[PDB]
Structure 1
Amino acid sequence: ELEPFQKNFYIESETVSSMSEMEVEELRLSLDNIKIKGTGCPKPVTKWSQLGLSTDTMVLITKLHFGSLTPIQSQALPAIMSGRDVIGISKTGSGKTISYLLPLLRQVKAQRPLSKHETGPMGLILAPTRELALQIHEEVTKFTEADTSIRSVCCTGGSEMKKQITDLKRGTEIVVATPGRFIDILTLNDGKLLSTKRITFVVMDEADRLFDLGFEPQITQIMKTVRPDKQCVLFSATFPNKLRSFAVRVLHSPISITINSKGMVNENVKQKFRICHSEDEKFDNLVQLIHERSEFFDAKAIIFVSSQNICDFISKKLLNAGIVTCAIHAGKPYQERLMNLEKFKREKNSILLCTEVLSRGLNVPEVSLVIIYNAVKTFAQYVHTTGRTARGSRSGTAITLLLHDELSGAYILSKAMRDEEIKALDPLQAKELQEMSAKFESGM
């Protein structure tokens, strides 16, 4: 008859809870393309203060972690603090450790102390190597140092067992261990020196490595002696089939968090840009682009603009210059939208001229060329506009006509383009891009 306990310690800050869904999508794209799976994921935070940690802890952390929250921290901290099981896929050095330590500290702190007959622990962190266990435990101590109500003992192989037994004699709220040693300690002396009965929180870090180094049997047996309503988080740089299979076995309604696994834009889309200095030059490029394309002759294009007034203007402009377009926007009667869409889907080598906001929902097949005439200002809009050309192997090209003053636009391009896409273009255009993006970035 299990003892009930609290796992959700998260109070969403007002500023975060005010965020809309579109805002949250955008924040995830900007944070190195965070991808989530699972139901009910809390919104990412962007500041240590949105987590409701005491001043002590705040001072301590800062001290402990210098600079901005990492993408993994932004998303994993509120999900774990909320008591959810979590799969966190991110590289070593992404700061993942505090992502689980803070919530673990909080959870263990809240539980009643160990009785005079209870060994502990309440929290268990498993690592595949002695070197990682020691590193994790060093972190832990930087927190248990201030607070004498909480101990951690590090239990690994390649190290005296008797030494660690002397520790565990005194009871311990937290254990950091390699799987073999832990199992060895559990079974030792009728399992009377270490109990699993009070473990409510298990973390497995570098989880892919645990299978690599043959620990499936040990970690599987450990999870079998742990209450199944425990909170469990699995952190790993990769997600091999073995881990995927293990998570299904040990987790409930997990939230998976993957940082920039793949590109925000399909890698088969060829992203390009041209930096211009007047609307006129932008228009000169747009025309050169439309003619040039013909020498490579389905093959259709879509010019995206930012407003209905711009769409009308550019439509007339392009007309006066011998180029006929199928123009579309929400200020036009639906009947003529349909006429233009059908004309576009009908006529060979047609050109659609469309507002960026209608891009996600356009009912047309993928195209060979997207010309973004007004650099978009969000990551979400960039994905929807460029995605109009995405088509696995048959993906075409998306090109942005950017103006010298469009700093945020350059920030988006610098974050969504592949490095090798920026290399193949003129090194001065490239250099301006990076300068534009840096200026925007320090602008905040």
Structure 2
Amino acid sequence: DWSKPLPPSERLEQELFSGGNTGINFEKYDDIPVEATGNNCPPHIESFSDVEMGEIIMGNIELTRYTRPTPVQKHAIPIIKEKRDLMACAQTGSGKTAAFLLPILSQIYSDGPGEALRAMKENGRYGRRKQYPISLVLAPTRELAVQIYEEARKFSYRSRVRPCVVYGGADIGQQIRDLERGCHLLVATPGRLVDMMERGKIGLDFCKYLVLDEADRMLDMGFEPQIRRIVEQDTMPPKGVRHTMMFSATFPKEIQMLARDFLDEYIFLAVGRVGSTSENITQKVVWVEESDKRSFLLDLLNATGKDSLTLVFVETKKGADSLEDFLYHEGYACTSIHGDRSQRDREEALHQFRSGKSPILVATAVAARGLDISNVKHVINFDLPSDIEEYVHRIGRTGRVGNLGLATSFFNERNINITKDLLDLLVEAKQEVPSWLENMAY
């Protein structure tokens, strides 16, 4: 019914498609060993023309300048087209978002809204036009939710499918009003989705496509209850009925087994070693006592100041506030993003950083996962994380779609616990290994 497009608008085509910046090593993606585990896994394609993507999908693909698919896309677009549950891991900045957004949209174009939602184009209470989304994508932070919502808007162009997004901090009424205009695909962070549901504005009764982006994060001790409250404890179709996809660049074993409570006869994609980094990212680790970090940071900022964006991670919200003040008063064009900032300031910070107006962003891990920003060329771990997975995700903000990047990290007493893991990751990444780091790992 819906695979036939609608009139275009050059206004929106300019407002949506930037132009895309494919990296120099976009072809080295083919050098990566892919693993597929499970019953009757469909074959991996090599071109977007190897399967039935609607006229809409191929048109919008040729708008974003995607030449040929990435490994995870080649393997996962069919699996989701085959309506199978999926757990996929692929390196940071390797195209997972489109890997789950293209097939879902193609399938909703073919299958249409279904008998269920076609049975509600006759009536509806005024205002209490609760929306029944077909698909739900859940992400761990607000800005990542919006980034995915925007990618959705790009791919649902000239289609009858209209996506929305709901997330905390923002005005609740504006989101309600945007829902009432019609929600088919819903991106959300957990708390605001539960708030919408307990207000009777959203219902998961016809939700047949579930996505957990940054899945291992959505399944930690803090998010597992909320994921259950949305999936198990409410009106969402259970496994086997709904189709559950989980994408991450990391999956610890324990979390990979906990994720089974939401999956049914699933494929397991592994585009590389689960938890591996891109080769395009040069990793430098330097010893820095605490009392010296600031001075040391300054030197880095004075060097890589060409036309590149620099992202600086710290471990607390107070710390981000304190450094951002320090750098501001030392004359730098900077902002910060952390939890204690209002959502307006938070998104504005992200915008200024993305547009170059403030090329230095001090950040807590709100920005560790999921965000891709063009021309981010240096990533600085002012504070190291406590585990190697947070580290992989952090340094993944640079060196994305084949482009190269630098990642410098401050190390000292407080970081002893990570030594071994960091050391190991340096080896398989083919990176310089500080000798005192080896001697520190016994």
TM-score, normalization: structure 2? 0.50
CA shift, 1:204, in A, is: 0.7
Match of 1:208 among 216, 219, 222: 216
Paired amino acid for 1:259: V
Paired amino acid for 2:150: E
Instruction: Measure, in 2, the Cα distance between the counterparts of 1:37 and 1:175.
Output: 29
Q: Establish whether residue 163 from structure 1 lines up as the match of residue 174 from structure 2.
A: yes
Contact persistence 2:131–2:202 (CA under 8 A): yes
From the two aligned structures, give the one with the greater helix fraction.
1
Q: What runs of 5+ residues in structure 1 fail to find an aligned partner?
A: 1-28, 264-416, 422-444
Match of 1:187 among 181, 194, 198: 198
Alignment of 1:4-403 (within 5 A): 32-109=32-109, 110=111, 111-112=113-114, 113-114=117-118, 115-116=120-121, 117=124, 119-147=131-159, 149-188=160-199, 192-212=200-220, 214-224=222-232, 225=234, 226-228=236-238, 229-261=241-273
CA shift, 1:93, in A, is: 1.3
Instruction: Measure, in 2, the Cα distance between the counterparts of 1:82 and 1:95.
Output: 20
What SS does the aligned partner of 2:73 have?
A: helix
CA shift, 1:171, in A, is: 3.2
Q: What runs of 5+ residues in structure 2 fail to find an aligned partner?
A: 1-28, 125-129, 276-426, 432-442
> CA 1:56 to 1:181, structure 2 compared with 1: closer, same or farther past 3 Å?
closer
Per-residue CA shift, 1:372-406, capped at 9, x if unaligned? xxxxxxxxxxxxxxxxxxxxxxxxxxxxxxxxxxx
Contact persistence 1:70–1:95 (CA under 8 A): yes
CA shift, 1:238, in A, is: 0.6
Paired amino acid for 2:204: T
- The runs of at least 4 aligned residues of structure 1 exceeding 6 Å deviation read none
Q: Which residue of 1 aligns with 2:389?
A: none
CA shift, 1:106, in A, is: 2.5
> CA 1:144 to 1:69, structure 2 compared with 1: closer, same or farther past 3 Å?
closer
Contact persistence 1:108–1:123 (CA under 8 A): no
> CA 1:420 to 1:162, structure 2 compared with 1: closer, same or farther past 3 Å?
closer
Instruction: Measure, in 1, the Cα distance between the counterparts of 2:93 and 2:430.
Output: 24
Per-residue CA shift, 1:217-236, capped at 9, x if unaligned? 11112111311110010001
Instruction: Measure, in 2, the Cα distance between the counterparts of 1:262 and 1:158.
Output: 33
> CA 1:222 to 1:246, structure 2 compared with 1: closer, same or farther past 3 Å?
farther
Paired amino acid for 1:85: D
Paired amino acid for 2:184: E
Instruction: Measure, in 1, the Cα distance between the counterparts of 2:266 and 2:162.
Output: 29
CA shift, 1:209, in A, is: 2.1
> CA 1:419 to 1:237, structure 2 compared with 1: closer, same or farther past 3 Å?
closer
> CA 1:207 to 1:420, structure 2 compared with 1: closer, same or farther past 3 Å?
closer
Instruction: Measure, in 1, the Cα distance between the counterparts of 2:148 and 2:162.
Output: 13
| CA root-mean-square deviation | 2.8
What SS does the aligned partner of 1:69 have?
A: coil
Paired amino acid for 2:175: Q
Contact persistence 2:249–2:274 (CA under 8 A): no
Bigger radius of gyration, 1 or 2?
1
What SS does the aligned partner of 2:66 have?
A: coil
> CA 1:420 to 1:100, structure 2 compared with 1: closer, same or farther past 3 Å?
closer
Contact persistence 1:86–1:232 (CA under 8 A): yes
Structure 1 stretch 36-45 or stretch 64-73: which is displaced more?
64-73
Instruction: Measure, in 2, the Cα distance between the counterparts of 1:262 and 1:177.
Output: 26
Instruction: Measure, in 1, the Cα distance between the counterparts of 2:213 and 2:430.
Output: 33
Instruction: Measure, in 2, the Cα distance between the counterparts of 1:37 and 1:65.
Output: 31
Per-residue CA shift, 1:211-256, capped at 9, x if unaligned? 4582111111211131111001000111124531332100000101
Instruction: Measure, in 2, the Cα distance between the counterparts of 1:213 and 1:418.
Output: 30
Q: Which residue of 1 aligns with 2:371?
A: none
> CA 1:221 to 1:201, structure 2 compared with 1: closer, same or farther past 3 Å?
same
Per-residue CA shift, 1:8-58, capped at 9, x if unaligned? xxxxxxxxxxxxxxxxxxxxx965111111111111100110022244432
> CA 1:244 to 1:162, structure 2 compared with 1: closer, same or farther past 3 Å?
same
Instruction: Measure, in 1, the Cα distance between the counterparts of 2:33 and 2:41.
Output: 16
> CA 1:92 to 1:159, structure 2 compared with 1: closer, same or farther past 3 Å?
farther
CA shift, 1:163, in A, is: 1.2
Instruction: Measure, in 2, the Cα distance between the counterparts of 1:150 and 1:179.
Output: 22
Contact persistence 2:37–2:268 (CA under 8 A): yes
Contact persistence 1:31–1:71 (CA under 8 A): no
Paired amino acid for 1:214: G
Instruction: Measure, in 2, the Cα distance between the counterparts of 1:51 and 1:204.
Output: 24
Paired amino acid for 1:175: L
Instruction: Measure, in 1, the Cα distance between the counterparts of 2:47 and 2:193.
Output: 36
**Count of matched residue pairs:** 239
CA shift, 1:67, in A, is: 3.1
Instruction: Measure, in 1, the Cα distance between the counterparts of 2:58 and 2:274.
Output: 34
What SS does the aligned partner of 2:198 have?
A: helix
Paired amino acid for 1:209: R
Contact persistence 1:155–1:164 (CA under 8 A): yes
What SS does the aligned partner of 2:145 have?
A: helix
Higher RCO (C-alpha under 8 Å, 6+ residues apart) = 2
Per-residue CA shift, 1:179-232, capped at 9, x if unaligned? 1111111112xxx21111110110010112224582111111211131111001
